[PDB]
Ligand SMILES: [Fe+3]
């Protein structure tokens with residue numbers, strides 16, 4: 051139930067030494083003061099009392115952890131998970147619409163097509179696409195009590211050829227939660243709390259290395275100034291609008307061997 | 309009631325940028341992994357749930373905050389406060405014994421003499437010495453329910469000449485609390501959790517800059533390997549034993565103008 055790793059005492063000793071040394075160096079570089087130290091201590095306590103460690107770490111730290119993993123991989127680019135992924139979302143056939151409310155129906159549709167392939171571009175049987183994203187108000191299901199537990203969440207079962215056609219709503223930018231210690235941190239430095247419009251996805255196939263990633267939208271606000279530093283040029287979509295007024299886009303996933 | 313500072317949005321923006329950048333650089337230098345990231349997130353949450361932010365920060369971070377303050381000062385060396393200082397401890401006359409239990413009486417006495425002076429060595433009227441320290445079991449009053457609220461704590465009123473003669477018990481090394489996330493951190497890297505034997509003191513006088521500091525004992529265990537990195541050569545005492553079997557030492561305090 052609790053996370054574990056095999057990091058030797060020696061490896062942790064070297065990590066800790068550098069990380070503590072770097073922080074101490076910043077204190078010495080900027081002449082950090084005792085009143086500043088006191089504010090910083092109270093702020094660390096407020097983050098914990100506020101349930102905001104997942105939030106703060108995934109905004110400010112996760113992008114480097116993904117950058118490390120990215121060195122080992124040759125397939126589709128990864129991006130950060132973020133704190134809103136939920137396992138075992140209900141399966142949907144390869145052409146489907148995600149579960150949504152009447153209000154969600156009022157949003158311009160997005161029709162997302164593509165194929166899960168291996169590094170050589172051959173289509174993969176047994177592949178699954180797990181999709182989750184925010185509604186037009188910037189809310190995620192299971193992290194807003196008013197929403198049905200699986201709003202805009204599903205496990206898409208790709209066909210024999212690894213193909214999928216998933217219709218949903220067109221994502222919109224949103225602000226991360228700003229009524230706690232993280233919004234305070236951002237407001238005290240004259241920052242902004244916005245992420246660009248995006249889809250979240252986890253893509254898998256028998257005997258393949260899974261990929262966690264995000265997909266963004268050409269010309270969208272906040273792509274060049276994401277608070278989470280999680281956007282990459284290779285992950286920006288360019289949907290074309292239909293005569294039915296729906297947004298259409300094709301995007302393929304490419305998986306490394308396990 | 310809550311700590312405050314005047315740090316401009318610009319100054320905080322520069323501090324944050326460096327501090328976040330340094331941490332991200334460590335992740336990239338050591339190839340920190342996703343399971344390592346998950347352990348680190350759970351550990352930050354455990355520190356907060358455990359009431360251990362004062363502990364962890366004062367062991368691993370405070371010594372740099374004091375090193376900053378030390379640049380501005382010419383008097384007696386400072387050291388870290390640590391998390392156990394309590395304000396308004398009961399006043400005692402210039403020659404006194406600290407409050408203690410019968411058990412404490414069984415410990416070799418320590419008789420601490422000296423004078424509070426200005427930078428030119430002139431003795432100061434109105435000077436106070438606030439002393440607090442651990443008992444022979446490594447416990448601090450108000451942070452162990454079995455002890456009287458002011459065990460080994462007092463506000464010493466120096467004489468007209470700034471002089472004092474304070475008798476107490478001879479301090480002993482102790483381990484910091486190790487049954488929580490901080491002891492876990494230390495145990496996973498093959499570290500040790502010991503501080504050397506020490507007195508804690510805050511010394512003041514009308515219109516003077518106060519000094520927070522610690523005093524240590526020549527040849528004592530753990531002086532060269534303090535977990536808190538808080539010892540300095542200039543703060544090591546060399547008590548001489550009497551024919552009464554008590555330890556005797558003289559030490560002067562030297563205060564900067566406010
Ligand atoms: Fe998101």
Ligand SMILES: [Fe+3]
Pocket residue numbers: 390441442506508
């Ligand atoms: Fe102490």
